[PDB]
Each structure stands twice: as structure tokens, then as C-alpha cells.
Subunit: 327 residues, 4 copies
């Protein structure tokens, strides 16, 4: 089992560099950095992380094909590959509608766009002169002027079609879920895509980009996760809420409280233990270990400790290293 | 007189950081970094520069509004402002047609786009929630989540209209020219724009983004600048070649030789001494000083030593520091 | 009033770099780093601080003349001056007997050694070829091979004689005290030394290297400072305890409790409010401001927030910046 | 065969960091940094190299037991081990008489001092509380307060006794020589020491710390080496000079010209081709490969490209990577 961790550039990069360094010392394999125009740049951030780490792999989790031309993304991830000595990996997703509305971006044909963008990027990184005339992406003789070395590409995917596409073209899949039921479905979609492309499905690093919260005190752990779990439930499609036996009505109820900023309600009972059990990996190290082994049995090969990671980051990272990674 | 220097990310960022540090030690005020998808990322590069410098101002010279959404540009330059302690400055231009053709980008309405992008960026950096519905740029409630501090914005401009627009909205103008005749025309355009906006024209940092080549041996200096002068002449609009008494036919002749890669012709006599005198600041420290003071008299407030800088960068940077900046 | 802050390399340098950066943003003038063989190297630590800061002054507080040959100290502080663009300042003291016993070092003639070491160091930094044949320090034609620029030298001093020597040769004095009574005596000593050397006593930056603990909640503040105050009282010479009306017997009682590790006694009443008032600057921002202005009236020109700084570092640094430095 | 490279801090650390990064990309295993009070600090330099590299091993080549108390050396190399993620290696030698004279340091019992210092350092790094009462080095309960991980220790040695001691206690030996004849003798000495200690002699990394100069043009190569070779000669014991048929007169001759600053002399005659063959590995890649394979057959396991490396460093580092390391 590979282990990764996620940091949001809502903190200065220098502070994140320390968490990433700590992760490297604790045995993590990957640190992933979110990309949203409203927080710090994903690349200046990756640059200070690369300078302050030595062996851990790093990369965006996930950037997209719309806020930056794919040639710029290729050049950027390659730059981080050079600075870090080949530890860069590219996480690309279609982007989320909310962020795009604010940016005045037309989310047009996510599927085709993403596939074309990844094809173009793989060719750039590969050193080829790129010429494309796709339904969304086009290049006429573009080419990088420095060498990239090898850069794995992971797709961010939730929907059945994106999952299938990931099995067809990605080296890994970052899935925003925490429960075995969700990965049971995801693994099948990835498998269909893998066969459709004729590649061995076990080639793809199926990873759980989970809401993670660990602590020796389980109630301290769940409390740190409630708000995040709330936002997850608020944005979960009916189909998913269904799968976990969670009243679809609870979504509106929670969306409401969030709209009103009534976090007192969220902590007060709105976030039920069922929501916590279905949308996060939390509790004591034992609780988290059990969930992790269930995911392993279903075919998950990398587990990423996503926000909040735990009540206090530094202590949680150490807990994970000592009580989990050291298996 | 302020002094700046330009570096192209066709060299690894670590090597550029040393040149930048040396420039800081030699008394330069600004280092500017070019932005082209085919070289290293302008931002990962600015990040390593920021970490290895302390007081010199830094920034892209120049990025654009098309290869990255303006919100991403705001976030990135603000990120560099945070890391460097407020030493970031933003250089924005409309971009060059050649690069955009390769990237499959429609250069649509450079003027309106650039104006709207700068208005949006100033608002982001300023901490406002941005809502726009311009003819090229739109945002719906977008807003940065961290504070930017103050970030001056410089426009890259060559054409009369861009120049006028810079006088109307920018804090400085990076003009790709080297001769007083060109700046005589540019200063008038900037002045028209400044009056059109009701601001004091002396607020804008009129800067000469020149082709610079300095050495104790003048012939070593001109030879280092010929190829660059060639590309400048090849892309100069008839109107400009005219102004310097350079046969407009020479442009085709040189464009030809460049197409065939016959640099032996370029060095052999195609680049005339007249072209060198009109499109570059080069020679010995005295020659360069004379030209610089001529530009100063015309109203130039910042001189940037652009490529090649000199036969060997390290020695040239020291020469400029010792024989020019120390006035 | 200048403001400084102290960090002990008992934390990794990367974590300290963030606190130092924060201090820079909060308006501090100096960050000082302690030097003891048992924690991280004072210089590798200053190196990562220099790379992650831009304007704040940095330096050891304080290193000494025994654990490293003075020529090495000269070279090291000059190396940090180069990397940081001239923000290095040298804090040198005679060293503490406890640390030296462990290192098997004979604390021989602190006074003469310190004076000779500082004379040699000033000459190295100044570019001179050094030749000395003092009663403790000797050099025969030694000389730095790179330029240092200017580096102020601060002496660490507690005793009347060291204080006098500081007034005679240092640019500043780091005094381990927090109460006006102690600085009343110190300022006289520094003045005697200043006159003995014929220099204007107001040239020296008289600074209070104080035990500092600030918080909106005063009791949270004093509790964070008790253990540190305990060790201060435990090591205070009878003369000093006397000056603050503190039973000299309390020193043994506290030393005992410390020996037995009975910190429950220290928190339980052993550390009296009188000890807290005489050996630390703590309480709410108002309490701290009052003490600071008392020190200012006595002639203190720099106040350093030494350990613990506050219940939690990050929050305390921000408190000091907002409720104190912004005067 | 392992490959290493040496840099002297007579250049700013930022510039060295690029050469080190390049070496990492070109396949070198080790970069070694010299330690002399007159150049930049060996540790601030190692700190910037560590931040700008990722996998290559780094360390002082070589520091000593006299200019810094061994506990400080332990703490410093441990600090670099932490920052670099365990890539630190310690090179310790007895120091050279010329540097010590200038520093006013009595070179007392190099052998016992070096052995005791290494024993103390291994114990510090190992986490032990150190107590020693040797004939040169003493400690009373000293102990590091942070964990070092593993740090190999290499000894710098030329003399037969130092070589024997290295075989007895070191993990590797950095020998200042370039010719098989010298390594034939050294390997025997190291073997005697290894048997005296009962360890397998093939445990020690016998390395040639050679004067190296490589270039497609053998003559520009040997000219780049003349100065370094001059200093190597003027410092060779007559036992050595005699070993290479070089007139023991040529040392006073060369030494004189050095004191005079007469480098024209060294370049135009005093440094003979006998001296170049005797004390350096230089010519074309083929010439260098032949010599390297000769050393390999004699038992050398690491070859370090020491100054000048080649006519121009950057090009030489690439030549070695391409035409030698890629074997
Ligand atoms: C587009 C969407 O795909 P999705 O996989 O559900 O996307 C939801 C989220 O994964 C997506 O918004 C992400 O980018 C969110 N996201 C982040 N997004 C960010 O922008 N930044 C982040 O840091 C972030 C982190 C992150 C980590 C992992 C992860 O999986 C997601 C993350 C969708 O609904 N797809 C459906 C429908 C497909 C469909 O038909 N879409 C197009 C296809 C058009 C064509 O085929 O050309 C259509 O309508 O025509 C499907 O996959 O079946
Ligand atoms: C668009 C063009 O502008 P220009 O200023 O002449 O363009 C030349 C360059 O400044 C521009 O191509 C640059 O971005 C090139 N450039 C680089 N370009 C890059 O992309 N990146 C770099 O790193 C680079 C370095 C550089 C440094 C400084 C600098 O001055 C320019 C640099 C132009 O022709 N403008 C005309 C007319 C423009 C016009 O009329 N507007 C639109 C109408 C828009 C509307 O109203 O709807 C039209 O032409 O259709 C004018 O200035 O009057
Ligand atoms: C030497 C000593 O000076 P002192 O000022 O009392 O020393 C106390 C401390 O300053 C000394 O232990 C420090 O180095 C502690 N110290 C640190 N020391 C460290 O080793 N590391 C640190 O990072 C640290 C932090 C610190 C910060 C500020 C500061 O004020 C000093 C700091 C002393 O006792 N001096 C007396 C007596 C001097 C005297 O005449 N006796 C000696 C003088 C030598 C001679 O005769 O020439 C002799 O005769 O034996 C006096 O000043 O009156
Ligand atoms: C002391 C001397 O040792 P040596 O090994 O010949 O020393 C020559 C060099 O290795 C030594 O001066 C180095 O520190 C030089 N040196 C550097 N030294 C530096 O100071 N800085 C550097 O960065 C540097 C570069 C370098 C890299 C590799 C390398 O091998 C050496 C380097 C010597 O005389 N050794 C004799 C024995 C001497 C002896 O026995 N005398 C004493 C021994 C102590 C005792 O009695 O126990 C005596 O018996 O009294 C021997 O090896 O047989
Ligand atoms: Cl910096
Ligand atoms: Cl690194």
C-alpha cells in the first residue's frame, strides 16, 4: 500500500513545506497539492516543497485543462520535474463547476477536453513536436525546449465515464471517496476502460483521496472531520447518498445550515455517524487501519490522507507514520 | 535612473538565480523573466529566484492574458509577492502571434482583453470580490483568499495604441526598443493615454527593454548582439525600419537567411552597423553610457539590459554594476 | 524601539524559518538564534532562515569564542552576510559554564578571550590580514578571501565587567534580563565602558533579551513563563535575587524541585508572582506594553521576545505585531 | 566505480549549488566541499547545496578536529543529515600546517586527535552520551538532543600512518593522489590497518581525490591543471616528490613564485610535465578513462574529480557524465 497526503495552499508554502518534509520522514510516498485560483499558486507552492524535500514524490492533485493552456501545464510540471530530480507527478481533473463559474469559465466537454489535454501533455513531456486538431484542443508544431524525463499522469475522477476514461489513459486515478462500496463501483469502471484500451488494469494506481482524521482520542478525530464531511454530503449526487443509506433530504438540510453558516447545527447532530462512516476514514489508528485494509481488499493501491488529516496536522502526520505506515 | 535585467528560462532556474543574486549585489533594481510555454515556467522560476534573493524586485516580463486565466495570474503573482516579502511586480503584454499560433490560440482583441485583464487583476490583488462582464473577460464573484499587498503592473507595448493604453492604466511600460527616436514616439503616446485618464504622466516608469551587449572589447560586444538584432529587424514593422533609415528590403533578406539558418550570412554582413546602432545598446561601457543618457533625456526612467547582456553574462553583469550603475 | 525575537534550534530549521518569516511580516527587526552543540548548528539554521526571509536582520544570539576558532566564526557570519544580502549581525558571548563542562572546555579568561576574538573578527570582516599574539588568541597572516560587507557585533553580557567591555567595543549588548532595575545597573556599566573608550554611549543598541510570554489571557501567559522563570531564578546570583527582593533561599528550594523534576511544585506556587514580575515580560498586551515603556525610559533600545514568546508561538508573534509593534 | 566531485567555497554557495545539481543530473554519487577559514563556511555552503539537490550525497572534504570542537562538528553534519534526508557524509582529515599556522593553531598529535575525534563523533551521531578522557579529546556527559540517522565517516590521509589508521576506523579514505603507484602503497597501508582492526578491508571506500582536468583538447586541459598541480607540488613531502622523480628543489622554486604571486611563472615553466603526470588525471575522455581503469585495477572504488575539473566547469561536468560515468 502506497501512502499520500494532501495540502491546500490556503496556508503559506513555507508552512506546507514543513508538513511535506515531515511526511517524507514519516514514510509517505506522495504529497498532493490542490489547485484553485483563490489560494496560492499550485506551482510556486510545489517549487518550495521540491526545494525542501528530497525523495518524496510531489504534484498537483489536481490541476485542470481550462485555467491554463495544456502547453503551460506541460512546461510547469516539467519544470518541477527538473528542480526536484524527477519526483514530479501530474494530477489532472476536469475542474469543479463552482470554481469555474466564478472564473467565468464554460465547462465545455470535460471528457474530450481532458483526454485531448492528456494526450498533448504526454507528447510534450515526451519531447515530441505537437500538432493536434481535436474537438477541444489544438496545437500547431508546439514543442518544449528542455527535457522532462518521465512524468506519471493521474486523473481525478468521480463520474462513471471519467473513471472509465482513466482506466483507458491514466497511470493512476485520484478518487474522492472513502468507502469500499464506492471503490467497488470505481474499480469496475476503471477495468472497463482498461480493457477497452487493451492494457492491464493493474497498471493503474487506484487511489483513495479520502477525508482523513486520526487521533488517539476518537471523538477528537470525528469532530475534526464533521465540517469537511458536511461539505462532502452537501455535494454528493443522490445516487451516492443512496448507496450509503443516507436520507437524500439530509443534503438540503445540511446545505441549508452551511448556507446560513450554522456550523453549530452541523456539529450539533446534522452530521450523523452514518455520514462520517461513509465519507471519511477516521477515528483511532485501529479504526483507520480497518478501513484501509477493507479498501486494499477492494483494489485500492494508494491511500491519501486528505483534509483535515487530523485535529492537528503535525501530530496526525506522526501518528499515521508510526501507527499505520509502519504497517 | 533605475536598472533592470532580463533572463530567459531556457537555462535552469538554479543557474538564473545566481545571475539574479549577482544583479542584486551589483545594484540592479529589477530582474525580469520571460514567459513562453516552450521554456521553463515563469512562476516556478520566479519562486527559486525569490528564495535566493532578498531586496531586488522581481517579476514576469511579460506574461499575458491568454495562456492562463487572469485569476490564475493574480494568484500566482500574489504568491510570489508573499514568498518574496512584497518584491513582486507584474509585467503583462498581449503576447506574440508566433507563440500563440503554435499554442492554437486566437489572438482576439489584444487591446480590450489586456485592459479587462489588468482591471480584473488589480481588483483581485486589491482583495475585492470580482464581477465582470466585459467583451473578452468575465468573472462572477471570484475572490482571492489570501492577501496580496501591493503589486505594481507594467504593460509590455510596442504599438501606438498599446502605448496609449499603458499611459492610461499601467504603473510602467516595458518597451522593446533601444533608440531615442523610438522612445520619442512612445513617450508621446504614453502622455496622450495619461492625459486621457487624467493622471500625471510622470507616474509611469517608462522603461527601455533593450537588446544589451557590453564588454571592454567593443567588437566582442557587437558580435554577441548580431543574431538578436537580426530577429529584431526581421520582426520590425516597415514604419520602424523606416524611422532608422534601414532598407525595408533588408528585413526579407534577413528573414530569408534566418529561415535557411544561414547565420553565417547574418554575421557576415547582413546585420549592418546601422541595424546594431538602432536596435541595441552595445559596445564598451562608455558607448553604453552615452546611449543611456540619451534615453534619459528623452524621458526613459528604467533601462533593462536584455539579451544577450554581453559576451558572457557574469562578467557583463559586473561590468554594468561597476562601470554604469555606480553611475 | 527595535523589536527582536529568539528561536532555539531544538526545532528543525524549516519550522523555525516559518516563525522567522512570520516575524518579518509582523514588523520585527531581528531574529536571534541560540548556539549550543546539543541542538542544530547555528549556521545551517541561519542559512535556511536567510533563504526564507528578505529584509529582517538575522544572526547568532549568541555564539562564542571557544567552540569554534574565531577565524571560522568570521568566515561563517560573513557567509551568511553574503547569502542574505547583508542582513547578518553577530552575537558573541563568553558561553555558559554548564555547556562548556560537557564539552570538556576550560573557560579560560572569558574577558580577554572575548575582547581579542572580537578584535580579530572585526579585522577579518574588514578585509585585513590578521596578525595577533594576545594572551588568548593568536593569528599569523590569516585573511578572508571574499568580501564581508558590514557586520555589526553585539556582545552577550550579564556581569558588570562584561557589560563594561561591551560599552567599550560592541555595537550592541544582549542582556539576559527583563526588569528596569537590572537595566538601570547595566546602562551605567555600559556607559563607563563607552567613556573609557571615548565613544558616544548612545551608539550601542542596549537590548533586553527577555523571557517573554504574551496572550490575551494573562494567566495563560504567566503559566507559559513559569518554568523558564524557574530556571532563571535557579541560576541567578545572590546579588540579583537580592535586588528584586526575592528570598535567596528560594533559589535552593527551586533548584531542588528542578533537580527532582517536581514541576508540579514550580507551577504550584514555588514560582512567586514576584519572580515572574522581576524575570519576565509577560501578561496581556497591555501588561507587556507597560513593562516595555519602563525599559525604554531606562535606555533600552531593542526588546527581544525570548522563549517562550507565548503559549503558542504563531499566535504570540501575531499578537506582538498587532498589539505592540504597531505601537 | 563511484564518482565524486570537489568544489571550493571560493565561489558563492549559490553558484556551487548549480554545479552540484548538474553533477547530480550527470550521475555523480558524491560532491565534496573543502573547509578553510579563508573561504565560505563549509556548512552554510553544504546547507544551500542540500536544499538545491535531491539524491546526491554531500559532505565536507575534509573538515578537521582543530578549528571546531568535535561536538560542534557532530551537530553540524547531523544538521545537514536532517535537512538533506540522510545524504550527509563526513570527511575528516588532520588539517594542513599552512592554514593552521595562520590560525595560530598548534598541530598537536594529529593521529591521536583524529582517532579520538572520530570515536567521539561516531558516538554523538549514534545518540550516546559521550564521556572521554583521551590524550587530546575529552567530554563529560555531552549528548546530542536530536537524531542523526546514519552518517559514514571518511578520513583524509596521505601519510602511511594516517592511511593505516583509516583502514582501522574509517568508512572511506580520501587520498590526495592520482597515480597508480601512489595507490599501490596506500592500499597496503589501509589493508594493514583493516587487519589490525579485524575488519574486512573491502569495506572501506578507497577514493582518489585527484586533480582532474578533462577537455576534448588535451592541451587546454593540462593548462587548466598547472596552478592546482603547483600547489600540490609545493606541498608534497620530499618522500613523495622523490617517489615521482621530481627534483626536491622544484618545491622551493615553485613555492617562491607562489609567495611572489608570480602565477605567470607556474604557467610558463616551473610546473613541468613530469609534475602533471605525477599529480593529476588530465587529457581527453579516453586519456582519463585509461587512468581511471588503472586505478580501479589497483583497488580504487571512488574517483573524485577535484579542481580544476576542466577548463570550464559546466562543460567538464557534462563531459564526465557523458563520456565517463555512462562508462
Ligand atoms: C465532469 C464531471 O466529472 P466528474 O469526474 O464527476 O468530476 C467531478 C470532480 O472530480 C471534478 O470537478 C474535479 O476536478 C474536482 N477536484 C478538484 N478540482 C479542482 O479544480 N481542483 C482541485 O484541487 C480538486 C481536487 C480533486 C482531487 C481528486 C478528485 O477526483 C477531484 C478533485 C462529470 O459529471 N462527468 C460525468 C458525465 C460525463 C459527461 O458527459 N461530461 C461531458 C463530456 C463531453 C465529451 O465527452 O466530450 C458532457 O456533458 O458532454 C461522467 O464522468 O460520467
Ligand atoms: C497587439 C499588438 O501589440 P504590440 O504592442 O505591438 O505587440 C508587440 C509586443 O509588445 C507583444 O507581442 C509582446 O507580448 C512580445 N513580448 C513577449 N511576449 C510574450 O508573450 N512573452 C514574453 O515573455 C515576451 C517578452 C517581451 C518583453 C517586453 C515587451 O515589450 C514585449 C515582449 C498590436 O499590433 N497593437 C496595435 C493595434 C492593436 C489594436 O488595434 N487592437 C485590436 C482591436 C481590439 C478591440 O478593440 O476589439 C486589433 O488590432 O484588432 C497598436 O498598438 O496600436
Ligand atoms: C564571563 C561571565 O560573563 P557573564 O556575563 O556573567 O556571563 C553570563 C552569560 O552572558 C554567559 O554565560 C552567556 O554566554 C550565556 N548566553 C548564551 N551562551 C551560550 O553559550 N549560548 C547561547 O546561545 C546563550 C544565550 C544568551 C543570550 C544573551 C546573553 O546575555 C548571553 C547568552 C562572567 O562571569 N563575567 C564576570 C566576571 C569576569 C571576570 O573578571 N572573571 C574572569 C574574566 C576573564 C579574565 O580574567 O580575563 C576571570 O578573571 O576569571 C563579570 O562580568 O563581572
Ligand atoms: C598529519 C599528517 O597527515 P597526512 O595524512 O599526511 O596529512 C596530509 C593531508 O591529508 C592533510 O593535511 C589534509 O587535511 C589536507 N586536506 C584538507 N585539509 C583541510 O584543512 N581542508 C581541506 O578541505 C582539505 C582538502 C583535502 C581532501 C582530501 C585529503 O586527503 C586531504 C585534504 C602526517 O604527518 N601524517 C603522518 C604521521 C604524522 C605523525 O605521526 N605525527 C604525529 C601524530 C600524532 C600522534 O602522535 O598521535 C606524532 O606522532 O606526533 C602519516 O600519515 O604517516
Ligand atoms: Cl531570500
Ligand atoms: Cl532538496
Amino acid at each position: 500500500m502506497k501512502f499520500g497526503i494532501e495540502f491546500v495552499p490556503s496556508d503559506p508554502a513555507l508552512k506546507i513545506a514543513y508538513y511535506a518534509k515531515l511526511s517524507e520522514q514519516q514514510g509517505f510516498d506522495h504529497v498532493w497539492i490542490t489547485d484553485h485560483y483563490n489560494n496560492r499558486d499550485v506551482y510556486s507552492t510545489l517549487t518550495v516543497l521540491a526545494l525542501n524535500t528530497n525523495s518524496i514524490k510531489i504534484g498537483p492533485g489536481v490541476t485542470n485543462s481550462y485555467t491554463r493552456n495544456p502547453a503551460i501545464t506541460a512546461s510547469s510540471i516539467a519544470s518541477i520535474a527538473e528542480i526536484s530530480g524527477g519526483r514530479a507527478v501530474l494530477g489532472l481533473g476536469p475542474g469543479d463547476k463552482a470554481t469555474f463559474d466564478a472564473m467565468g469559465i464554460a465547462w465545455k466537454k470535460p471528457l474530450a477536453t481532458t483526454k485531448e489535454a492528456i494526450q498533448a501533455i504526454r507528447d510534450f513531456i515526451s519531447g515530441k513536436k505537437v500538432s493536434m486538431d481535436g474537438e477541444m484542443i489544438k496545437f500547431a508544431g508546439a514543442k518544449l525546449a528542455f527535457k522532462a524525463g518521465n512524468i506519471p499522469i493521474y486523473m481525478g475522477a468521480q463520474g462513471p465515464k471519467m473513471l472509465e476514461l482513466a482506466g483507458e489513459i491514466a497511470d493512476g486515478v485520484l478518487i474522492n471517496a472513502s468507502h469500499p462500496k464506492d471503490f467497488e463501483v470505481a474499480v469496475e469502471q476503471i477495468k472497463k476502460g482498461a480493457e477497452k484500451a487493451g492494457r492491464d488494469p493493474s497498471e493503474v494506481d487506484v487511489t483513495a483521496y479520502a477525508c482523513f482524521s486520526i487521533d488517539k482520542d476518537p471523538v477528537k478525530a470525528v469532530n475534526a472531520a464533521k465540517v469537511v464531511v458536511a461539505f462532502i454530503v452537501a455535494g454528493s449526487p443522490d445516487l451516492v447518498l443512496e448507496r450509503h443509506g443516507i436520507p437524500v433530504e439530509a443534503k438540503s438540510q445540511i446545505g441549508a445550515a452551511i448556507a446560513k453558516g450554522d456550523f453549530g447545527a452541523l456539529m450539533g447532530g446534522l452530521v450523523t455517524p452514518q455520514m462520517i462512516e461513509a465519507f471519511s476514514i477516521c477515528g483511532t489508528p485501529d479504526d483507520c487501519m480497518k478501513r484501509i485494509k477493507d479498501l486494499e481488499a477492494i483494489g485500492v493501491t494508494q491511500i491519501v490522507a486528505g483534509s483535515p488529516i487530523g485535529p492537528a496536522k503535525e501530530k496526525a502526520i506522526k501518528l499515521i507514520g508510526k501507527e499505520i505506515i509502519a504497517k
